[PDB]
Design an enzyme around this catalytic site. Sequence first.
Site, mmCIF file in Angstrom:
data_model
loop_
_atom_site.group_PDB
_atom_site.id
_atom_site.type_symbol
_atom_site.label_atom_id
_atom_site.label_comp_id
_atom_site.label_asym_id
_atom_site.label_seq_id
_atom_site.Cartn_x
_atom_site.Cartn_y
_atom_site.Cartn_z
ATOM 1 N N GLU A 69 0.714 -1.227 0.131
ATOM 2 C CA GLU A 69 0.162 -0.025 -0.051
ATOM 3 C C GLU A 69 0.919 1.183 -0.601
ATOM 4 O O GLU A 69 0.365 2.043 -0.577
ATOM 5 C CB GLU A 69 -0.792 -0.118 0.956
ATOM 6 N N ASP A 129 -6.275 6.547 -5.101
ATOM 7 C CA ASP A 129 -5.929 5.445 -5.334
ATOM 8 C C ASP A 129 -5.844 4.891 -6.237
ATOM 9 O O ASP A 129 -6.128 5.622 -7.747
ATOM 10 C CB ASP A 129 -6.761 3.801 -3.917
#
EC number: 3.2.1.17
Length: 162
Positions: free
Chosen positions: A11, A20
Amino acid sequence: MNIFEMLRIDEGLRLKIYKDTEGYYTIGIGHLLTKSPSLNAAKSELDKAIGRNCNGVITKDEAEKLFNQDVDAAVRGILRNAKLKPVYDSLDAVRRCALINMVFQMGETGVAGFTNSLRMLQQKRWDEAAGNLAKSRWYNQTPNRAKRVITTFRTGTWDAYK
Ligand SMILES: [Cl-]
Ligand SMILES: [Cl-]
């Protein structure tokens, strides 16, 4: 290697609101803030989450606090889910981390939808599950991360992250 180190590799860490891979408003260590298109809707969600006026920026510590919550929520959600719990219980420690990784990324409902793959993991048919899991939008959208997770499930070792 542990779940935390694993997710942190997958991540990354970002102290300022970002989008994202799917265009959503995120912060810290993969913490989804909102699926809404507004930056303001993100900035408000962020402040609700932290308990201060952040104006889209957070400290490392705050990022970690969020990460601790999310991992815990993910594990509790698996244990609470009638489809996931049996799978998790049948697994070894390494493979368990791989299922947590999926749940953190895709949510409990999403993973709970990989019926076929779940059944093969429970049956310990490693090669066949790796193969089925690759047939998904997940794999097509974030291929390097999915391959890492998939190798984890095929092998039962931390090789991909090493
Ligand atoms: Cl596909
Ligand atoms: Cl990727």
